[PDB]
Design an enzyme around this catalytic site. Sequence first.
Site, PDB file in Angstrom:
ATOM      1  N   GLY A  94       2.341   6.008  10.154  1.00 21.86           N
ATOM      2  CA  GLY A  94       3.756   5.889   9.817  1.00 21.86           C
ATOM      3  C   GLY A  94       4.388   4.595  10.307  1.00 21.86           C
ATOM      4  O   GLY A  94       5.504   4.259   9.917  1.00 21.86           O
ATOM      5  N   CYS A 104       3.371   1.605   9.576  1.00 19.30           N
ATOM      6  CA  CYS A 104       3.206   0.568   8.559  1.00 19.30           C
ATOM      7  C   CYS A 104       4.549   0.054   8.111  1.00 19.30           C
ATOM      8  O   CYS A 104       5.465   0.843   7.876  1.00 19.30           O
ATOM      9  CB  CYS A 104       2.390   1.081   7.381  1.00 19.30           C
ATOM     10  SG  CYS A 104       0.682   1.521   7.790  1.00 19.30           S
ATOM     11  N   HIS A 147       0.801  -1.218   0.000  1.00 15.71           N
ATOM     12  CA  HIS A 147       0.000   0.000   0.000  1.00 15.71           C
ATOM     13  C   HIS A 147       0.848   1.289   0.000  1.00 15.71           C
ATOM     14  O   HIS A 147       0.269   2.369  -0.093  1.00 15.71           O
ATOM     15  CB  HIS A 147      -1.077   0.027   1.102  1.00 15.71           C
ATOM     16  CG  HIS A 147      -0.571   0.126   2.512  1.00 15.71           C
ATOM     17  ND1 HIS A 147      -0.220   1.345   3.078  1.00 15.71           N
ATOM     18  CD2 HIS A 147      -0.467  -0.837   3.458  1.00 15.71           C
ATOM     19  CE1 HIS A 147       0.131   1.073   4.325  1.00 15.71           C
ATOM     20  NE2 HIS A 147       0.001  -0.225   4.601  1.00 15.71           N
TER      21      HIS A 147
HETATM   22  C1  LIG Z   1      -6.415   6.624   7.128  1.00 17.35           C
HETATM   23  C2  LIG Z   1      -6.044   5.283   7.672  1.00 17.35           C
HETATM   24  O1  LIG Z   1      -6.217   5.015   8.854  1.00 17.35           O
HETATM   25  N1  LIG Z   1      -5.497   4.382   6.813  1.00 17.35           N
HETATM   26  C3  LIG Z   1      -6.263   3.523   5.893  1.00 17.35           C
HETATM   27  C4  LIG Z   1      -5.579   2.210   5.573  1.00 17.35           C
HETATM   28  C5  LIG Z   1      -6.289   1.231   4.878  1.00 17.35           C
HETATM   29  C6  LIG Z   1      -5.678   0.061   4.461  1.00 17.35           C
HETATM   30  C7  LIG Z   1      -4.345  -0.127   4.737  1.00 17.35           C
HETATM   31 CL1  LIG Z   1      -3.580  -1.627   4.290  1.00 17.35          CL
HETATM   32  C8  LIG Z   1      -3.609   0.821   5.418  1.00 17.35           C
HETATM   33  C9  LIG Z   1      -4.228   1.987   5.866  1.00 17.35           C
HETATM   34  C10 LIG Z   1      -3.460   2.991   6.698  1.00 17.35           C
HETATM   35  C11 LIG Z   1      -3.422   2.581   8.172  1.00 17.35           C
HETATM   36  O2  LIG Z   1      -4.292   1.872   8.679  1.00 17.35           O
HETATM   37  N2  LIG Z   1      -2.368   3.074   8.859  1.00 17.35           N
HETATM   38  C12 LIG Z   1      -2.087   2.914  10.231  1.00 17.35           C
HETATM   39  C13 LIG Z   1      -1.466   1.787  10.768  1.00 17.35           C
HETATM   40  N3  LIG Z   1      -1.332   1.535  12.076  1.00 17.35           N
HETATM   41  C14 LIG Z   1      -1.815   2.430  12.927  1.00 17.35           C
HETATM   42  C15 LIG Z   1      -2.456   3.632  12.540  1.00 17.35           C
HETATM   43  C16 LIG Z   1      -2.980   4.567  13.467  1.00 17.35           C
HETATM   44  C17 LIG Z   1      -3.605   5.701  13.031  1.00 17.35           C
HETATM   45  C18 LIG Z   1      -3.746   5.953  11.671  1.00 17.35           C
HETATM   46  C19 LIG Z   1      -3.260   5.075  10.747  1.00 17.35           C
HETATM   47  C20 LIG Z   1      -2.595   3.887  11.147  1.00 17.35           C
HETATM   48  C21 LIG Z   1      -4.061   4.383   6.526  1.00 17.35           C
END
Ligand SMILES: CC(=O)N1Cc2ccc(Cl)cc2[C@H](C(=O)Nc2cncc3ccccc23)C1
Lengths: 298, 302
Positions: free
Chosen positions: A136, A138, A41
Amino acid sequence: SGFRKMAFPSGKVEGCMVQVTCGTTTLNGLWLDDVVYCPRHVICPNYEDLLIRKSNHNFLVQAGNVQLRVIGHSMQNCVLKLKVDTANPKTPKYKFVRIQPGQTFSVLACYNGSPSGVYQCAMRPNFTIKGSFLNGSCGSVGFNIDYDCVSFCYMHHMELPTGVHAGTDLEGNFYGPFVDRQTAQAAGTDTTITVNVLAWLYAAVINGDRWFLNRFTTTLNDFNLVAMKYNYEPLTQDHVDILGPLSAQTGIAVLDMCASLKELLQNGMNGRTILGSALLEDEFTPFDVVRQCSGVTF
Amino acid sequence: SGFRKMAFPSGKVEGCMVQVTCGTTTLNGLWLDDVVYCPRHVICTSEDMLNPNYEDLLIRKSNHNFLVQAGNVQLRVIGHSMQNCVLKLKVDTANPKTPKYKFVRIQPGQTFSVLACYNGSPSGVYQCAMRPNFTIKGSFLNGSCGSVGFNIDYDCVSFCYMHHMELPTGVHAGTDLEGNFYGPFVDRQTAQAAGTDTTITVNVLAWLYAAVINGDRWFLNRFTTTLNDFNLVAMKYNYEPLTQDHVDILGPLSAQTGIAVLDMCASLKELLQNGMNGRTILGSALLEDEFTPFDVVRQCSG
Ligand SMILES: CC(=O)N1Cc2ccc(Cl)cc2[C@H](C(=O)Nc2cncc3ccccc23)C1
Ligand SMILES: CC(=O)N1Cc2ccc(Cl)cc2[C@H](C(=O)Nc2cncc3ccccc23)C1
Ligand SMILES: [Cl-]
């Protein structure tokens, strides 16, 4: 004496953390030999369509204050494998392992390829991890250290609406019925890892906490009927066998400890604590208890 | 989202762990530049431990009596000196893995990570708090002496603890990296007991702010309190007195959440009175006191 939620020394993993930037997205990568592994992603969905539009120079990889040049790229399930020119000199002895629910592992949480913290985690029976992750994070990895080999088992991808986390093994296969995109996704109903609670009760016995012990025993079937009522995972004969060493060390048969858990589940703690906790702890496996109560080093 | 008891990455500290052997005794040492720091009780026998004259015992030792092992490489001890309860073994090799470091003495309630080692080999990392009674609730077996506690702020490792002994209640006592013990403890097998422990109030409030930042608000109430009335209630539950310094320290969390420190104090007073009533706060049925206000800000923001 003492019982703590202990993680594996993160040093071997720290030497592999890099920053991966693609467009406006910045996340973490795992640099092993000449490949950088990161969540696909980072390119964001038709991932084959999005990836074919990218060139090697679109992925900016940073190892400390040194930029690594990407010479190739391929996708394996939900992981992006960025071939780089430099083989990581700090690459440890490693394996990619997929873990089962109930299994524990350490998480080295990173932001911008920089490790900020290490904590101990368990793969929940619902395939989520109750982690501590901000935006961040990820690409942060989960691992176990077996002798001198780092077993990579998890790569963080996303956070679910309940604040729990979802990710994949290092081959890009998700843990759970999750997908790597913004869509309505929810963690299923969770259950308590029974073998892990029993293991933690043995760790409490080894540490002098015996108040919960009773004279009773139970059949595995009678216990599994009680466990199912409290959203506890079924205890198998494999779990009973796995608890064998702890049962021999404390002199409390696994089904004898099951009868203690049965009474704790129906009657509660009654204002008492076990290993400084008012809840039954399920994020220590039987191996974690043996490793911490005998002193295994890496 | 999420709140975990998070330890600092141990890598910088792992590259400093060595094994120190003196006669039959084996424990861990911290190798920084050309000095190895370790508990001075490495020179003692189990008998000597009741009333050891460490100056008398050290004067009888030569450099070659201390066997120092860094991985599969024996280091040559070229000098030795004692600074309080730490032995400083000067060696002929400067540690190439020596990080940017400082020796810091911490106050009760402060947290740090512990890299537990046996035979100079790291086996685990966990999070700890210096208890108000100057002990730490660690996880240590025999051979863990010399394991260190640290914080990593930016790229510098602040060494704040070296493990020396386990008290009869299963709790641990040790020193800062200058050999000064935390607490009224001595490196002797004499009758020693940890004083009555108390809950680190500023840390419980900090963890309640962390719960608010994570969406948990069930415990909040419409009440406020004076600082004095809070301490009068707090003392009855064996909680540490909350000082104006603590109130000031909680300022940023109070501003971020919108809940005044004395309103958060009123929530705590109520939780002490009522208990949790089957509910949890940040996955816990007990009030957590091993997260400082600094820990909460670092974990809930970056
Ligand atoms: C806007 C959002 O939350 N996201 C959507 C999303 C959808 C699918 C995939 Cl594979 C990734 C992601 C990302 C995502 O989950 N990122 C994050 C990971 N771990 C903790 C987090 C804590 C607060 C925010 C993001 C975090 C970004
Ligand atoms: C009673 C005992 O074993 N010892 C007496 C003693 C007295 C004074 C000093 Cl400075 C050191 C020590 C040592 C000591 O506390 N060692 C240990 C340290 N941390 C955990 C332990 C867990 C089980 C056993 C020892 C442990 C050795
Ligand atoms: Cl401090």
